[PDB]
């Protein structure tokens, strides 16, 4: 049901947060974009590698900016065509095609926020540290699942942790909408079992 995928509640809330009881000046999905823009992990992306480490060649921020635009264009078309297909969404709840575009843009913007430096080699180095390095000393003290993470460090999990990191005085981190978090997650599964099928959503965790 599409009425449930477009959730507006955030962590620590207790009310319903209905769509028809909100001001159109600043939508909840637009607040997510504003919060991500002003964040420090997002600002640190200007110094990270796309392809060529360390000019007119793209970095991790421009890449995100470009994706934030293309995905917004895709999501706005998709939302327009759904509303065309489903009329009850714009008659009872009060949804518009800008909502999908905003959600996809917010998800697109922070989709590469937790990647380690030096691009593709950083995650491999982190994984190999706990396999053919000193980190193998910690193998006996950890369970199978925890050791799996560490030896298979991922950028998506790190990005989710950065987005939802709780700190004293700031519960929930950036406190983004649940729809944005759902759209951001590409592999909704744990680290084990390792590649149980040929599906697109179980290659990694």
Partner 1 sequence: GFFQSERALFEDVAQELGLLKRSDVSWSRHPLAYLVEAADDICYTIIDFEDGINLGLIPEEYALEYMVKLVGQTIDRNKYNALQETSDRVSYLRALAIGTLINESVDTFMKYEEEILAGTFDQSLIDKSNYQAQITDIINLSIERIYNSREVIEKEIAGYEILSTLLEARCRALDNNDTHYNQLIQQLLAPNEKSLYENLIQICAEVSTMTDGKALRNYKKIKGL
Ligand X SMILES: Nc1ncnc2c1ncn2[C@H]1C[C@H](O)[C@@H](COP(=O)(O)OP(=O)(O)OP(=O)(O)O)O1
Long-range contacts formed by 80-84: CB under 8 A, 24+ apart = 82/2
Tell me if 70 contacts ligand X by CB under 6 A: no
Distance in angstroms (rounded) separating the CA atoms of residues 199 and 187: 10
Compose the 102-141 pattern: x for residues touching partner 1 by CB under 8 A, - for all others.
Answer: -------------------x--xx--x---x---------
Distance CA 136, CA 121 (A): 20
CB of 116 to partner 1, least distance (A): 14
Binding test (CB under 6 A) with ligand X, winner from 50, 98, 158, 164: 50
Three-class HEC string of 133-155:
CHHHHHCCCCCHHHHHHHHCCCH
Residue 120 sits in the site that holds ligand X (CB under 6 A): yes
CA atoms within 13 A on the CB side of 171: 4
Between CA 148 and CA 159 the distance in angstroms is 18
Tell which one of 18, 51, 92, 142 touches ligand X (CB under 6 A): 51
Task: Tell whether residue 199 is a contact of ligand X (CB under 6 A).
Answer: no
Which residues make up the interface to ligand X (CB under 6 A)? 50-51, 119-120
Which residues make up the interface to partner 1 (CB under 8 A)? 121, 124-125, 128, 132
**Which residue ranges make up the annotated binding site for dGTP?**
50-51, 60, 156, 186, 204
């Amino acid at each position: 049901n599409w009425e449930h995928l477009l959730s507006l509640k955030r962590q620590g809330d207790t009310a319903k947060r209905l769509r028809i009881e909100q001001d159109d000046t600043r939508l909840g999905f637009e607040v997510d974009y504003d919060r991500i823009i002003f964040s420090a992990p997002f600002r640190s992306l200007q110094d990270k590698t796309q392809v060529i480490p360390l000019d007119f060649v793209h970095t991790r921020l421009t890449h995100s900016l470009e994706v934030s635009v293309v995905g917004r264009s895709l999501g706005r078309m998709v939302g327009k065509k759904l509303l065309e297909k489903y009329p009850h969404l714009e008659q009872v709840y009060g949804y518009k095609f800008n909502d999908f575009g905003a959600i996809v843009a917010a998800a697109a913007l922070a989709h590469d926020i937790g990647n380690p430096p030096f691009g593709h080699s950083g995650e491999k180095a982190i994984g190999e540290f706990f396999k053919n390095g000193y980190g193998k000393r910690y193998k006996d003290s950890l369970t199978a699942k925890e050791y799996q993470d560490l030896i298979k460090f991922e950028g998506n999990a790190n990005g989710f942790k950065v987005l939802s990191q709780s700190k004293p005085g700031a519960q929930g981190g950036l406190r983004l909408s649940y729809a944005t978090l759902g759209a951001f997650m590409k592999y909704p599964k744990e680290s084990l079992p390792h590649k149980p099928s040929d599906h697109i959503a179980d290659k990694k965790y």
